[PDB]
Design a protein around this ligand. Structure first.
Ligand SMILES: Nc1ncnc2c1ncn2[C@H]1C[C@H](O)[C@@H](COP(=O)(O)CP(=O)(O)OP(=O)(O)O)O1
Ligand SMILES: [Mn+2]
Ligand SMILES: [Mn+2]
Ligand SMILES: [Mn+2]
Ligand SMILES: [Mn+2]
Ligand SMILES: [Mn+2]
Ligand SMILES: [Mn+2]
Ligand SMILES: [Mn+2]
Ligand SMILES: [Mn+2]
Ligand code: NA
Ligand code: NA
Ligand code: NA
Length: 326
DNA sequence: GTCGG
DNA sequence: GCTGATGCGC
DNA sequence: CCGACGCGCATCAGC
């Protein structure tokens, strides 16, 4: 965190462009600039120094100069003081409320946790669950707990069918000490790019996790994707564990590695690897790696039996999940 | 907001 | 009541 | 200096 002051500012700037401006690309630009600086091994002493890095342009170089000189950023003082921006920014902290709904609630004078309680009948099911766990969802999950959660999920899955294969990905797979949520990748032999589909592969597992009361609520659920809420077992009287966000994604077994690579991240890493693979005549998504034709049309899915295979296809030195946290 | 074209 | 349109979070 | 940088699910506006 040699440049924690700078990256903190680029992030808050990023989130403003995301929630308020609804400018997803400026959002990206800011996270990208904060991502390269976070990887910069020297304490930045001036914007010009920062400007040398790809992602850090003119406007940001200046903001850095100001931050380095003033200890703060006026543009951000204004943002935190502006009632509209601050309310919208706050509302998006509730799961289920994105930029659009937050901005609408605000146009109607709904801008605080209290107003949501008051105007609850206006919220959808997902948003209601979001408000109910507003405090719990913002809590980081200690790896120590991510481990207990892993065992419960892996165990319950094996209890359903011994051939299932759940793999906890995301920041956890990256070896992080604490995580935002818990992401689980699932596969079964009876489900591949063909198989004429298998009904309820994800259901059964989700249903079992509910049977042992690990999963407490559902935000959205489909045949391949599940977003919900869970909670470690509570002693028998003592303090209850915080409710946590869990995501389960069922992917075809013959696409497992491309899937673990994606759901493992990091998010900026994926954006980085994708762009690279595209400079190398390949196109990568969360399911397959395809070669790009002389024209630009993606050929068929190359074979993949390991994350490294994907690194090889794009002339990139394989990096362990611990070195992808960009 | 950035940078390759 | 249906569905194209859009929002949401990953 | 211009302009590229999406998916599986839920909901509801416009019929
Ligand atoms: N828009 C996007 N573009 C590219 N990749 C994206 C993505 N959204 C999610 N991903 C992928 C990579 C993340 O590691 C992975 C998990 O998505 P996630 O939102 O759970 C964040 P994670 O990286 O696990 O850290 P944490 O904050 O939860 O502790 O999903
Ligand atoms: Mn150096
Ligand atoms: Mn009020
Ligand atoms: Mn995660
Ligand atoms: Mn997730
Ligand atoms: Mn019960
Ligand atoms: Mn509870
Ligand atoms: Mn490259
Ligand atoms: Mn432009
Ligand atoms: Na630069
Ligand atoms: Na939100
Ligand atoms: Na539809």
């Amino acid at each position: 965190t040699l440049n924690g002051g700078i990256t903190d500012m680029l992030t808050e700037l990023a989130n403003f462009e995301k929630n308020v401006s609804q400018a997803i690309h400026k959002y990206n630009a800011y996270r990208k600039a904060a991502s390269v600086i976070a990887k910069y091994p020297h304490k930045i002493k001036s914007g010009a120094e920062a400007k040398k890095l790809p992602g850090v342009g003119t406007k940001i170089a200046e903001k850095i100069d100001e931050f380095l000189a003033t200890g703060k950023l006026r543009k951000l003082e204004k943002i935190r003081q502006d009632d509209t921006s601050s309310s919208i920014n706050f509302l998006t902290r509730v799961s289920g409320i994105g930029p659009s709904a937050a901005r609408k609630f605000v146009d109607e004078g709904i801008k605080t946790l209290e107003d949501l309680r008051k105007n609850e009948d206006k919220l959808n099911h997902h948003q209601r669950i979001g408000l109910k766990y507003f405090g719990d969802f913002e809590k980081r999950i200690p790896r120590e707990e991510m481990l207990q959660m892993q065992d419960i999920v892996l165990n319950e899955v094996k209890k359903v069918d011994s051939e299932y294969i759940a793999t906890v990905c995301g920041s956890f797979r990256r070896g992080a000490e604490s995580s935002g949520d818990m992401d689980v990748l699932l596969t079964h032999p009876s489900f591949t790019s063909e198989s004429t589909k298998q009904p309820k592969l994800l259901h059964q597992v989700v249903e079992q996790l509910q049977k042992v009361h690990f999963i407490t609520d559902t935000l959205s659920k489909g045949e391949t994707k599940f977003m919900g809420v869970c909670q470690l077992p509570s002693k028998n009287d003592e303090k209850e564990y915080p409710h946590r966000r869990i995501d389960i994604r069922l992917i075809p077994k013959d696409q497992y590695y491309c899937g673990v690579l994606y759901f493992t991240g990091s998010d900026i890493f994926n954006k980085n690897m994708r762009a690279h693979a595209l400079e190398k005549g390949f196109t990568i998504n969360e399911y397959t790696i395809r070669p790009l034709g002389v024209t630009g049309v993606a050929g068929e899915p190359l074979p993949v039996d390991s994350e490294k295979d994907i690194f090889d296809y794009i002339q990139w030195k394989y990096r362990e999940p611990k070195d992808r946290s960009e």
